Specification:
The structure is cut from a larger assembly and holds chains A (about 425 residues), B (about 60 residues), C (about 60 residues), D (about 220 residues), E (about 40 residues) and F (about 230 residues). By secondary structure, chain B is mostly beta strands. Helix content of chain B is about 10%, strand content about 25%. Chain B contains 1 helix and 2 strands, in the order αββ. Chain B has one helix at about 25; strands spanning about 35-40, 45-50. Chain B is globular and about 35 Å long. Chain E is mainly α and about 40 residues long. The chains are: A alpha/beta (about 425), B mainly beta (about 60), C mainly alpha (about 60), D alpha/beta (about 220), E mainly alpha (about 40), F alpha+beta (about 230). Chains in contact: A-C, A-D, A-E, A-F, B-F, C-D, C-E, C-F, D-E, D-F. Chains A and D meet through α2, α5, β3, β5 and β6 of A and α2, α4 and α5 of D. The complex binds flavin mononucleotide, iron/sulfur cluster (4 copies), FE2/S2 (inorganic) cluster (2 copies) and magnesium ion. Chain F: One of its GO terms (molecular function) is metal ion binding. Chain F: Its main location: mitochondrion.
Chain lengths: ~425, ~60, ~60, ~220, ~40, ~230
């Protein structure tokens, strides 16, 4: 079976590109804020079942069943408040979808927050938006004010008797505060260093209360799933990879953009259709990073026949991640690009725990020596081993994600590294 | 490699090399070395007493 | 140098049990003082207590 | 890449606990509005918004400002110092009137971000971490700013200028130094993240309310 | 009409737009829960 | 009721909420640690105490992971040994070569656990990190190039002594421990940070350079400076 060629009548995120009104009047002109009271009266179990049938997976990196997570938070109350934290710290390089959703579909985001809060029995929803997105945060606040004035959220939300608050928390610059436990720590006015698990956020979250952290895209697609079916959402995509997805195609491509497509569209077709293809044509392709910095890269051979899907990319020794497709053509320094990614991880490391802190600095130094050839061929395996020592021995997943691009570079472009080292040795021995 | 009479060396600038680390005192088989140290006037880690009993040393 | 006149200044003996040590001391005739072994008491540790909703165990830093 | 900024404080006449700083009455109203976004008994959660407000009022964060925030929120000044030194958007040193931040990560590096940086350096005659003699412009490099598809891009006082070329960034700098406020957004004729050639999706009018609503819902 | 950028309201914001909106939203909120103590250090 | 856990296949009954480290302690095995102190809170950031559960693909932090029913804790497994070697490699990669001029010397946990649980060789071919030394009074001498960022002094300061003038400033590999200002950590319980620091970063200033741990003779007496009788 073939996937892709999504129809505008089925694309969830209308008003993308900001060609229409993003206010409450415009959002209500589309399907937003329709029978929300009826959904709330249907209640938590109905919403959870609908999400589980739709088979939605986490859209902000690691893809876990959102139905399972929200059911985890669906435990009975114990005398403590309940919070839904919506992650909007779009710090992963290559990713712009959350920015587009916040800037052009803020009422969709707010309705999704209300629906998720009803599903989880949450009194409040804190939308943690990164501090660079000042205008996006202001648009979100204006949309929240319009919703409150219209009575859609607040006390007796949508005329359903459910009391729900929506606060917007602007963070500072911290790709680590992008993480869920670091998100929780920064909301509490602390440094923003990830916690250990257990306790899980669904058990002890922000302020020590049960919280559920969900991505902006996930919460935004929740109310459309509720109003529509979820058999429909499951129909779009593969068997265990259902729904639509926002892809940010960027890099050495003709028409970099953000688009919405199905969950199993082949990478080559997506690049050739929605981006105009590589600048020098498909024969000029060198490598593609399909999920932002965290996911490894794949060469042209793998990209020739590969599906932009969770399992399809996992089978290719990669990951879907945030569906950020960075394209590199033949006329690029792949070693320098990976060194720049590792330098990014060095700057954004929170420094709490020894493996990531020390090892990421060490890998940055080794890569910086690699890009100029000032190394030996025996250091490639040493770099592989130290990257394997960082992965799985850290508190959070930033350390794991700082080793995967290195592993991908070593796995697919070892001849380039060896050639550069040999060239440097010849250049220096001529003195 | 000949092992004869002992000596305490200096850096080319004239500073004494010994830093009162007491590794020689720890490793001496015959316990011939007695070292006592304290911070110097300039704050360096230097010895005030460094004795070797050459009748106890086994060279 | 530091001098001494006590033959038994550096003498330390190792025993597996208090009863063995006391038996040795008694048969060799020296007086002895026995000190009971001190073991740390078990302590309840929890990482989740660092983020209590209403208790004072919440930490201000990490 | 060395950061170049220390994380220890040496008292100076321009930066010491006796430096005068106190919030305006309007900012005190804003503080009391921010404080009640969090449960009672958790006032320490407002450290980041209050510190950001202090920075927005004063232009940067003197140690007196940090102490004032700590006093207002009844939190330890060491905790405030931890937050301030941890988060990079807080200026613990005076900056220029316009704080240019050029993104240099890989998605922006694949496009000519180095050309943008070089054009800014030549236009202003300053290095990559210095300030203009007239205290008007400061230039730094930063990591991904969330506008990768519109690379290369810079941020100048919470405004994104995207799809930049050396000519465009020079024009923006000229407009800033003249006195005008340039319009933020792409400079390549695009309005937003849409593909440059034309809309490959969302070409038809959106469907109205209740298009494919479930039978029961 | 699908050819004009309608998100043009953001070429007017100032330094205190976000916090002023937050002040305006203060009226519509609901009473915050309490931990029973004024501070973790109390 | 007590739950049954297994350490290297040996059964042991522990109360629910007991950590892997405490279960191994009950069976008599002391797991390596740097940031864990039983008198302080659980931090779990040095990552030295990682152990392998028999069926778990991922190693767990022994100092913070509560035991579940029927867990087999493989303390001396290949994964555990490799985890310890990696963590020790990172620590000694950034540490300075100050052992002979260091008061910690022969009573250093970094040295002992490096000799017992780490490798015997170094793969670090880069430059090291040097950190400016802070001043916190006349009692404690700080040489912060030797710090391993275990945050014991921070947790002790706040929790035990009620003084919140210690913390971490900055982030990444440039993370530093200090007051961020010229402030003296003067308290009636200051030398205990000298005791709990596993490395020579915090050392006694009156005791500086005078002796080495192996020379000294230990006499067990009591204290007469106050009526507590320490
Ligand atoms: C915008 C955003 C940024 C994230 N950044 C990070 C990060 O830096 N490190 C990390 O380990 N996880 C990161 N995550 C993943 C979170 O830890 C967590 O998995 C996610 O927020 C949960 O959302 P989901 O249920 O929709 O997947 C990020 C997630 C989002 C949405
Ligand atoms: S892995 Fe890195 S970013 Fe994550 S907790 Fe450890 S030091 Fe912080
Ligand atoms: S104490 Fe002994 S081993 Fe140490 S520096 Fe002095 S002479 Fe050398
Ligand atoms: S702290 Fe330990 S490992 Fe470091 S210099 Fe001192 S004795 Fe050596
Ligand atoms: S100074 Fe010592 S106790 Fe404090 S964090 Fe560093 S190593 Fe730990
Ligand atoms: S890489 Fe520059 S905006 Fe993301
Ligand atoms: S002792 Fe457990 S991570 Fe430090
Ligand atoms: Mg010490």
């Amino acid at each position: 079976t073939s996937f892709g060629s999504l129809k505008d009548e089925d694309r969830i995120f209308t008003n993308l590109y900001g060609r229409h009104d993003w206010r409450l009047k415009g959002a209500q002109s589309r399907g937003d804020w329709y029978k929300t009271k009826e959904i709330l009266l249907k209640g938590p179990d109905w919403i959870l079942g609908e999400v589980k049938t739709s088979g939605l997976r986490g859209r902000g990196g690691a893809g876990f069943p959102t139905g399972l997570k929200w059911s985890f938070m669906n435990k009975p109350s114990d005398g403590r408040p309940k919070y839904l934290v919506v992650n909007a710290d779009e710090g992963e390089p290559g990713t712009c979808k959350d920015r587009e959703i916040i800037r052009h579909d803020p009422h969709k985001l707010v309705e999704g927050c209300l629906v998720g809060g009803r599903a989880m029995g949450a009194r409040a929803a804190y939308i943690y938006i990164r501090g660079e997105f000042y205008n996006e945060a202001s648009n979100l606040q204006v949309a929240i004010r319009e919703a409150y004035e219209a009575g859609l959220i607040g006390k007796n939300a949508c005329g359903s008797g459910y009391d729900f608050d929506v606060f917007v928390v602007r963070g500072a610059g911290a790709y680590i505060c992008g993480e869920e436990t670091a998100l929780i720590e920064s909301i509490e006015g602390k440094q923003g260093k990830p916690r250990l698990k257990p306790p899980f956020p669904a058990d002890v979250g922000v302020f020590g209360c049960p919280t559920t952290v969900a991505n902006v895209e996930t919460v935004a697609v929740s109310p459309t799933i509720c109003r529509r079916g979820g058999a429909w959402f499951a129909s779009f995509g593969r068997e265990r990879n259902s729904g639509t997805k926002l892809f940010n195609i960027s890099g050495h491509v003709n028409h970099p953009c953000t688009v919405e497509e199905e969950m199993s569209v082949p990478l080559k077709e997506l690049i050739e259709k929605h981006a105009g293809g590589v600048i020098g044509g498909w024969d000029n392709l060198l490598a593609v990073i399909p999920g932002g910095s965290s996911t490894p890269l794949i060469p042209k051979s793998v990209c020739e026949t590969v599906l932009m899907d969770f399992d399809a990319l996992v089978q290719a020794q990669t990951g879907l991640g945030t569906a950020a497709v960075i394209v590199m053509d033949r006329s690029t320094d792949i070693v320098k690009a990976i060194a720049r990614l590792i330098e990014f991880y060095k700057h954004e490391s929170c420094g709490q725990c020894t493996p990531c802190r020390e090892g990421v600095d060490w890998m940055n130094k080794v890569m910086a020596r690699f890009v100029k050839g000032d190394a030996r061929p025996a250091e490639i395996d040493s770099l592989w081993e130290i990257s394997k020592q960082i992965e799985g021995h850290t508190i959070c997943a930033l350390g794991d994600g700082a080793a995967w691009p290195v592993q991908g570079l070593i796995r697919h472009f070892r001849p380039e590294l060896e050639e550069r080292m040999q060239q440097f040795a010849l250049q220096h021995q001529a003195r | 490699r000949f092992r004869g009479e002992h000596a305490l060396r200096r850096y080319p600038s004239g500073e004494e090399r010994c830093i009162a680390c007491k590794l020689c005192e720890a490793v001496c088989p015959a316990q011939a070395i007695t070292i006592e140290a304290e911070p110097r006037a300039d704050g360096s880690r230097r010895t005030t007493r460094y004795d070797i009993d050459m009748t106890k040393c086994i060279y | 140098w530091s001098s001494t006149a006590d033959p038994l200044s550096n003498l330390v003996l190792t025993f597996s049990t208090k009863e063995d040590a006391v038996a040795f001391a008694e048969k060799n005739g020296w007086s002895f003082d026995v000190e009971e072994r001190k073991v740390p008491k078990p302590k309840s540790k929890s990482y989740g207590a660092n983020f209590s909703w209403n208790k004072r165990t919440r930490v201000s830093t990490k | 890449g060395a950061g170049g900024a220390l994380f220890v404080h040496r008292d100076t006449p321009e930066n010491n606990p006796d430096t005068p700083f106190d919030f305006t009455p309007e900012n005190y109203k804003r503080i009391e509005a921010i404080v009640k976004n969090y449960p009672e008994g958790h006032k320490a959660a407002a450290v980041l918004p209050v510190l950001d407000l202090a920075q927005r009022q004063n232009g940067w964060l003197p140690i007196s400002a940090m102490n004032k925030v700590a006093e207002i929120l009844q939190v330890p000044p060491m905790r405030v110092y931890e937050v301030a030194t941890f988060y990079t958007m807080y200026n613990r040193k005076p900056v220029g009137k316009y704080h240019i931040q050029v993104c240099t990560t890989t998605p922006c590096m694949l496009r000519n971000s180095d050309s943008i940086l070089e054009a800014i350096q030549k236009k202003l005659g300053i290095k990559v971490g210095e300030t203009t003699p007239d205290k008007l412009f400061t230039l730094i490099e930063v990591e991904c700013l969330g506008a990768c598809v519109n690379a290369p891009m810079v941020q100048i006082n919470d405004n994104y200028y995207e799809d930049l070329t050396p000519k465009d960034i020079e024009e923006i700098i000229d407009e800033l130094k003249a006195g005008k406020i340039p319009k933020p957004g792409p400079r390549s004729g695009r309005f937003s993240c849409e593909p440059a050639g034309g809309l490959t999706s969302l070409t038809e009018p959106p469907k109205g309310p209740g298009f494919g609503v479930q039978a029961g819902l | 009409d699908n050819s004009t950028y309608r998100n043009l309201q953001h070429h007017e914001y100032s330094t205190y737009t976000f916090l002023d909106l937050n002040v305006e939203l203060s009226k519509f909120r609901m009473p915050q829960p309490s931990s029973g103590r004024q501070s973790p250090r109390h | 009721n007590l739950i049954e856990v297994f350490v290297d296949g040996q059964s042991v009954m522990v109360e629910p909420g007991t950590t892997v480290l405490q279960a191994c302690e009950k069976v008599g095995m002391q797991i390596p640690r740097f940031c864990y102190h039983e008198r302080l809170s659980v931090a779990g950031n040095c990552r030295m105490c990682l152990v392998e559960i028999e069926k778990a693909p991922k190693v767990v932090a022994a100092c913070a992971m509560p035991v579940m029913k029927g867990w087999n804790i493989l303390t001396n497994s290949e994964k555990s040994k490799k985890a310890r070697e990696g963590v020790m490699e990172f620590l000694l990669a950034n540490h300075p070569l100050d052992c002979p001029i260091c008061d910690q010397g022969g009573e250093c946990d970094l040295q002992d656990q490096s000799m017992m649980f780490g490798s015997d060789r170094s793969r670090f071919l880069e430059g090291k990190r040097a950190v400016e030394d802070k001043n916190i009074g006349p009692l404690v001498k700080t040489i912060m190039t030797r710090c391993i960022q275990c945050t014991r002094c921070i947790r002790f300061a706040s929790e035990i002594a009620g003084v919140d003038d210690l913390g971490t400033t900055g982030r990444g590999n440039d993370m530093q421990v200090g007051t961020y200002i010229e402030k003296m950590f003067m308290s009636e319980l200051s030398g205990n940070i000298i005791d709990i620091c596993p490395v020579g970063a915090l050392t006694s200033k009156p005791y500086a350079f005078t002796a080495r741990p192996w020379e000294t003779r230990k006499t067990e007496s009591i204290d007469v400076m106050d009526a507590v009788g320490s």
